[PDB]
Design a protein around this ligand. Sequence first.
Ligand SMILES: CCCCCCCCCCCCO[C@@H]1O[C@H](CO)[C@@H](O[C@H]2O[C@H](CO)[C@@H](O)[C@@H](O)[C@H]2O)[C@H](O)[C@H]1O
Lengths: 1046, 150, 50, 50, 50
Amino acid sequence: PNFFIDRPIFAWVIAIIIMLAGGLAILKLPVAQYPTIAPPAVTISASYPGADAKTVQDTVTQVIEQNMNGIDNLMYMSSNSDSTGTVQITLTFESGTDADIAQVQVQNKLQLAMPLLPQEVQQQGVSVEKSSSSFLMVVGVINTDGTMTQEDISDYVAANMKDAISRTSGVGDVQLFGSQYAMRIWMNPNELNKFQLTPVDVITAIKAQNAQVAAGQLGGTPPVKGQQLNASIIAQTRLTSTEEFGKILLKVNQDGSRVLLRDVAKIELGGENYDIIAEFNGQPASGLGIKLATGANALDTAAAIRAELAKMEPFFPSGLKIVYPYDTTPFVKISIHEVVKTLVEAIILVFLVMYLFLQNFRATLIPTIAVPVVLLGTFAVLAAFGFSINTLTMFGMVLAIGLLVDDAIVVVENVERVMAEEGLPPKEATRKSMGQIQGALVGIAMVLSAVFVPMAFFGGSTGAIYRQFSITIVSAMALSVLVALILTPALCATMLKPIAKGDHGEGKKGFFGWFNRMFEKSTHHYTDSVGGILRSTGRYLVLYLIIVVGMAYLFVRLPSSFLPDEDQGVFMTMVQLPAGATQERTQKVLNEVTHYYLTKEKNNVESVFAVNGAGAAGAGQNTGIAFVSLKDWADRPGEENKVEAITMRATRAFSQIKDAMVFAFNLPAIVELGTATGFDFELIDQAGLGHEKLTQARNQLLAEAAKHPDMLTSVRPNGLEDTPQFKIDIDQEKAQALGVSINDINTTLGAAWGGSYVNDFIDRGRVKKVYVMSEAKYRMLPDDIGDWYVRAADGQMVPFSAFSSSRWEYGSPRLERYNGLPSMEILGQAAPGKSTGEAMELMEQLASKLPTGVGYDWTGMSYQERLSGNQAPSLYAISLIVVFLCLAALYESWSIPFSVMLVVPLGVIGALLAATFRGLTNDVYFQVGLLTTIGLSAKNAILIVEFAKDLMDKEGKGLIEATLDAVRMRLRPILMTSLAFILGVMPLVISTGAGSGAQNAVGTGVMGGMVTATVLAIFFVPVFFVVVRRRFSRKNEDIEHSHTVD
Amino acid sequence: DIAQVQVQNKLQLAMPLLPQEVQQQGVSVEKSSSSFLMVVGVINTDGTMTQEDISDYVAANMKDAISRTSGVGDVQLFGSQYAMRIWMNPNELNKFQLTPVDVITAIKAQNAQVAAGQLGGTPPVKGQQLNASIIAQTRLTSTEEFGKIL
Amino acid sequence: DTAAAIRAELAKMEPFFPSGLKIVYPYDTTPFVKISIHEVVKTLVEAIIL
Amino acid sequence: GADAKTVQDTVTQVIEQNMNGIDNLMYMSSNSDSTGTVQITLTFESGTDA
Amino acid sequence: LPTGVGYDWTGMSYQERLSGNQAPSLYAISLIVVFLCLAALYESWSIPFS
Ligand SMILES: CCCCCCCCCCCCO[C@@H]1O[C@H](CO)[C@@H](O[C@H]2O[C@H](CO)[C@@H](O)[C@@H](O)[C@H]2O)[C@H](O)[C@H]1O
């Protein structure tokens, strides 16, 4: 402290060391958009081709839900049993659990369940994965020539690119969009009755002829003596071409005219699945979703991947061009450009405020060295704690440009003051001044970490968001007061100019700031004033409570956000067709939507990625989804040219004009979180009941909540409602007669209409599948059932209509389970200005109006909200107590802390003022902001209260005289700090361009807060101080003429 | 945890060399104190159900969640969950000239779900308009329809 | 704490139980750990007072 | 039974396709033998948790 | 060798190529630390250069 005054070089060395650590930690520090925030979930997925909802729910789903146990830290189980044969069991774990352990343990209980599965599922694959819906990129591959189909392209994807990109530095998970080439063999029902054959015979034919064989070796061990030759018996090799599959022999006819497979079926290299069709502006396309590697450079993973893709550009086939429908990268690059712009802008402002106020170039340079240094270092402390440059942490730093700016200003000011007041040369001046502010500053460090640390401890995904802020800011601050104590006092004692005693430079110069008088008169005005306002304090205690009450009202009205919705350069629109619809209808709708975007939005849109089959609801021809890419924002000027009005005019288009519901929206900021003002209700069956009764209970609760539009709003299920299905009752009696095997009946019906993955081959070097399914025109409408024949042991064919009863009924196409038992998921939010928690209470009281065997429970968003929500009071209680205790220590008082803690309202009010006059919302940013403001306001209170006491004691001055003196000397720096600040933050508040959502959320609260805080504080702080001090002691007193200095 | 995974990683090298009755009965790899943490009991005060009635409610309503709770290693049930218990008569089998094997292949063939497919499925024919779920053979839900097994 | 989690899970299952099904508690190392260490607390506080 | 090209095209490189994104991996090297044996070695950045 | 045939080092010679490619930066950082360290202890810029 006093130490580094006489050691400017040791100070420089600590500076330089921290700077080098900064630049070093800055070069090699990750960049991601946001940090890891979702409470880890592993996904088990199994595809059971052909299976209906109940078949996967009962054969795979429940057998795995029953063998999942003994895995550490299980929060809940959620299960999709989809009628496209797919099962998705999503195990979401307690937050911050080892993803690695969760995945492996889950999978090791799964491999224990593996033999208890059907063999179709066992061979199709059950996969355990770590769930992130946040793909760094979706890279598109298209074909302009018109040459290639979806699967053609897809195959090229899988066999030329998919894994060369998967090399590039920064790439973790690689995923392909579409389906790879399989041996697609399409049976003909006529040409199968012709030569008297069923699927089973096709099947064993294909297994037998297309395989490897456990061979042997010449000259093997043990040998015979004198041996000399050793080589490998090459046995049966699998079939390379489609032709060679045509050649496979099903049966020989009696006269020798033989039957090769080609005759009974159409044969082709085809897709392994044809559920989803991917169009890129109508153009044939497949895709690849690349993930940023588990903690690496987003922007350099992007630069490397795009550079790598182009090395493959000279070896890409005809008319094959690459495209980028979804790109986190330019939005993050631009986020960062604006954080660097802001911090350096704020800093420049500080130079203008500091010069055009102290007019000493060497005084002006000091903070210019002071916070860059705190900057670099702050980076280094976060580097050490394992963090990255994402949005939350960088705005975590901007959010505290002010405490840093303040820290420097406080000191330089106080020194310049000591010289202008006392005439001391600079060295002795900096010791007098550090001697003055040192203890206070350690105090500010203890009150600032007393407010900023309780906000590091929240639980669930909210706590994560906060932890980033807590540590960024506590570290900027910690290193800030450290710099404040080591270097800058050395920089004041070492490059600061001596001021002639009582200089003040009134007039003394023509071409620059007659201002000094203009400042001076006024600062006397300020104190001329203040004593009068002390002279009858009464009114202000009224005014104060007025304001305090107001602060509350204005506050209770502020709406309760989570984060601002950002125009990401990218938004999407999804399509839901009526029940049971076909690939063709949905595909029509996607085509229309695309035309609308590319035309009636020709100034804006750049790309549509129409995807048929994948929709928001779940899987099925039924659903459709479109990724809509916009041009770069320097080509989208106006208000009606940006995502807000674009999405609004797109749903405008598609609502009023269709037979199907097609909605458009922009993605949320953090790609997986709560809708803030709502919930996610799962209605559960705990007693022994079937789907009928549970859905009935669901409808009952659906109506019971439509009866409260005053609390609850748009209470809906998130799934597919019962569609009609087609039951084929096999009368085993009839087929028990005809000499057919029930096996062959089931499995021919199967391999016909659902299909059969049967065997494996080797295409051009890469192993791929062999599928056998009926051709198109012989398996579409229930009539085609007839065209299909099963052969008995006695040689006689049988039509299906000979033993197949058939009807229509309903069935559920999507069977959900919650924690092992049948459930139906109810989404919902609360009516406008009603609490989410209230809606939750009314929900529990409504679902309590349901039959026994119907129970309820909470998940995800409303899960973390029902456990962690009583923390907000307790942590700021710890905060209040810890700060009060800290000040009590810094002074030597159980009462004086009150005149400074009382300043806190004075700052909150303007931010609320500001929220409302800017129509913004109480989101996270506003709140970290709240604190920041409270922070400076309190710091200033602390320095005023200190100087007051310091006079009162260590000069003998009296209460009023000394509070006057105090406030007097602290007027100029508050004003300097506040100007540089309000002027640094200013650009945030009025700025559009990517991440303006954030910048505005921040800026508003701060600027308003700063305004009402300084302009209030400079009149209330002496009153707090003066009033509170009159309840202590009982005498000795008001007071002066005292005494030692000893 | 690491040990569990390594031991179980050698168990995956023994898994195919075990019988299919064992593999389907389930092999379990666990971490667990050799002592009982607690014994939770359920009864019925009236007698309104026998032992196995209850035991079934225990194994089919509760046990799956006690055994998922984080921190629970081994759960051991005193008793058993309901199965379709079918008690052959050796005489009544010698009569119609039948062995257990016929019971087995019968029950295997008659009682199963079936991969059926979709009307108007993927890939479809042009001009299509119907898409819905073919339901085939379903599992035998009740106790009677088990007698009717042919 | 495993015991607290289990009391919670069982309390979730309480309302969809059939006619007259009561849980009963034959064996628990748990209440002893609490009451034993609690008697060590009663002692700390008393001793302070002495 | 399979020969080297058969294991390297059916088993080996179907495994190297999934070894992406694993943390603190220095290099990968894989042997494809014609006695049915396939052997992959992942060498990690030094001091990585084994 | 022909266009498209390349080289790399692994195991021992990889670790040796790391030792040498690292050797310069190690002598720059250690020299710089001694210098700051001395500039600090002996409050000077002259003691360090000399
Ligand atoms: C950063 C810049 C801040 C912008 C400030 C712009 C002006 C708005 C606030 C000015 C506050 C001064 O308001 C102050 O109020 C008190 C009333 O209690 C007056 O006080 C008056 O009444 C008291 C006793 O009744 C007497 O001392 C009397 O001599 C008189 O001073 C002061 O004369 C007035 O100076």
